[PDB]
């Protein structure tokens, strides 16, 4: 995260850390949507152009964490993946559309003060919350700057405003799609901030003023640098892909 601040303890209990076995390193962010299901970005574990394809066995998920490196026993909870299900429509070639993956946990993770699942928006909720002008919350252990400590000591957080499609689109030569939205501050607003290397897969969340609950409206996908003036972070439009998520959940359960 860029231009963010330290997350409070139990501020983002659904936050998940995608950790690689060997070597031992941070891979991406991710979110906990239930007892055994974790959500993340596709490209975090499938990118041919770099020869990257991990497997349930290459990977580990760390839940309830706060520190980026310290081992938090009795707090965090590491779990393994029974299976990986990434979206077949995942356009890894040109624009990274459908940047999304599920990952099932071999054993159901127990909930506590540091581990709780986030809600997924329904038609009405997605319609009510996902609008240009509203702000969302981004979180991750990604780098503090695009170019330049560099890595955060503890989970980072930042709030960003959802941007107008026409604007997002006239911001990059890349071919946007209805499956992705972009957020971030315009150059003439003062406040800045963005996701960055390592933040991918992380959740973009919003809180319902109606029922006091938190919803994941996006997945950190891609951007042209970090905290660039005139640039914006692009996030996977979750709901617009909820059908697939339901199919997999019930089918490959």
């Amino acid at each position: 995260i860029v231009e963010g601040s330290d997350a409070e303890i139990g501020m983002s209990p659904w936050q998940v850390m995608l950790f690689r076995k060997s070597p031992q390193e941070l891979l991406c962010g991710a979110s906990l949507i239930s007892d055994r299901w974790v959500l993340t970005a596709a490209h975090c574990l499938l990118y041919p152009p770099w020869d990257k394809n991990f497997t349930e066995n290459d990977l580990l998920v760390r839940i309830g964490k706060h520190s980026r490196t310290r081992y938090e026993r009795n707090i965090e909870k590491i779990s393994m993946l029974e299976k990986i299900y990434i979206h077949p429509r995942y356009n890894w070639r040109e624009n990274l559309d459908r940047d999304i993956a599920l990952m099932k946990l071999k054993k159901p993770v127990a909930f506590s003060d540091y581990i709780h699942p986030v809600c997924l928006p329904d038609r009405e909720t997605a319609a009510s919350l996902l609008q240009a002008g509203y702000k969302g919350r981004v979180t991750g252990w990604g780098n503090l700057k695009e170019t330049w400590k560099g890595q955060p000591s503890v989970l980072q957080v930042v709030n960003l405003p959802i941007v107008e499609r026409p604007v997002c689109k006239d911001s990059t030569r890349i071919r946007i799609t209805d499956n992705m939205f972009c957020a971030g501050y315009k150059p003439d607003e003062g406040k800045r901030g963005d996701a960055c290397e390592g933040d991918a897969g992380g959740p973009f969340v919003m809180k319902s003023p109606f029922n006091n609950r938190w919803y994941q409206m996006g997945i950190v996908s891609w951007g042209e640098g970090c905290d660039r003036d005139g640039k914006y972070g692009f996030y996977t439009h979750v709901f617009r892909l909820k059908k697939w998520i339901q199919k997999v959940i019930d089918q490959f359960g």
């Binding site: 490209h43 990118y47 041919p48 152009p49 770099w50 020869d51 890894w92 070639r93 040109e94 624009n95 990274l96 780098n143 700057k145 695009e146 170019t147 890349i174 960055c196 290397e197 991918a200 891609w222 951007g223 042209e224 640098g225 970090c226």
Partner: protein
């Protein structure tokens, strides 16, 4: 044995020749085809006998006979249109006109080394030079064309002329974008810095680095060609205060292999000078050092399997001309698409702004097609 271990022997010989030339001219640009040299020695060995053949055999470490097949297969694969990238190679041996050449010599040469052997009246210098310079121009698609002058091939005192020419310029698996090709500072040998055009690209390349027997460190990167069989290797001293001459002598095919088992992929800003290297080499003196002195002796040279009669035949001129161009042209943007995006954060650099040596390597065979040092692009 293994056609790989054999190619190893050939390439080694060429490299040893490279080391020789390099030490005698440290600050100059030198491009050689190690494998090409092995082919020339083969061409020669085919029609040589007695002491002459004995010398060639003990240097090459292998005898043309009983191996030709292995040598023909490798020499065929290298040029094979299956590489997608085309390596033009010309091989010719010219013999005095007033001498009847043998049939099996001509036949075998064209068969194993794709070499054209034929007569030419050296009695007339200008006529021979044009005749030869014209064959190279044709055999290399106008790529190379100026091996001999008129003041070189002179009189009937010139009996035998060997020639090997190699040209190359494949297509990068990851083309450079001209928009990103700007002039960057290059520090030459003398110490002076020059402003020189340089290719620049952000992508994943195999990298690495180790120390020489003298504990001096150098880096090396692999730049594969869209063909997927021929790749370019670049190595240069890690410390700016380290002379290239301090790493060269410690490099054999054996070390080139280590490179292959050591290098790992990593996202990098690879910046290397855009240049076109072309050098002509006289292999006479270097080859003498290796122990091959007979064939250069008007009387001692024994080439019986070359001539129908017992005429005295010796090597008057043995030459190689290698040409390579490094440019932007290559395959395009499919992995280049999003690959441009995931560069979320400036990556490390592989900047070649100091005298460096390069390799063109045919992976399947292990054949080292090119070996060069660039002191000033």
């Amino acid at each position: 044995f293994n056609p790989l271990s054999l190619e190893e022997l050939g390439s080694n010989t060429g490299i040893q020749v490279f080391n020789q030339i390099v030490k005698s001219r440290p600050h100059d640009n030198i491009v050689i085809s190690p494998h090409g040299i092995a082919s020339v020695l083969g061409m020669l060995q085919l029609g040589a006998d007695g002491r002459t053949k004995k010398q060639l055999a003990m240097v090459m470490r292998y005898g043309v006979n009983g191996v030709g097949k292995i040598l023909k297969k490798i020499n065929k694969a290298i040029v094979s249109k299956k590489n997608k990238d085309i390596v033009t190679v010309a091989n010719a041996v010219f013999v005095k006109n007033a001498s009847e050449i043998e049939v099996p010599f001509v036949t075998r040469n064209k068969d194993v080394f794709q070499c054209e052997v034929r007569n030419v009246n050296f009695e007339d210098p200008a006529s021979a030079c044009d005749s030869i310079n014209a064959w190279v121009k044709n055999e290399t698609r106008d790529m190379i064309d100026n091996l001999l002058s008129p003041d070189l091939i002179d009189g009937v005192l010139t009996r035998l002329v060997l020639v090997n020419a190699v040209y190359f310029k494949g297509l990068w698996k990851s083309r450079f974008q001209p928009e990103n090709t700007k002039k960057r500072t290059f520090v030459a040998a003398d110490g002076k810095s020059y402003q020189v055009p340089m290719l620049a690209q952000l992508s994943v390349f195999r990298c690495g680095s180790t120390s020489a027997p003298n504990d001096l460190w150098y880096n090396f990167i692999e730049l594969p060609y869209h063909g997927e069989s021929i790749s370019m290797l670049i190595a240069l001293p890690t410390e700016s205060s380290t002379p290239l001459s301090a790493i060269i002598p410690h490099i054999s095919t054996k070390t080139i292999d280590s490179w292959m088992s050591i290098m790992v992929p990593k996202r990098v800003q690879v910046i290397l000078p855009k240049f076109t290297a072309v050098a002509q080499t006289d292999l006479k003196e270097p080859l003498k050092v290796l122990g091959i002195t007979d064939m250069f002796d008007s009387s001692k040279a024994n080439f019986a399997k070359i001539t129908t009669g017992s005429e005295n035949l010796h090597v008057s001129h043995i030459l190689q001309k290698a040409k390579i161009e490094v440019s932007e042209d290559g395959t395009k943007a499919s992995a280049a698409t999003t690959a441009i995006l995931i560069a979320r954060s400036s990556p490390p650099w592989f900047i070649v702004d100091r005298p460096f040596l390069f390799f063109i390597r045919h992976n399947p065979t292990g054949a080292v097609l090119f070996m060069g040092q660039i002191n000033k692009p």
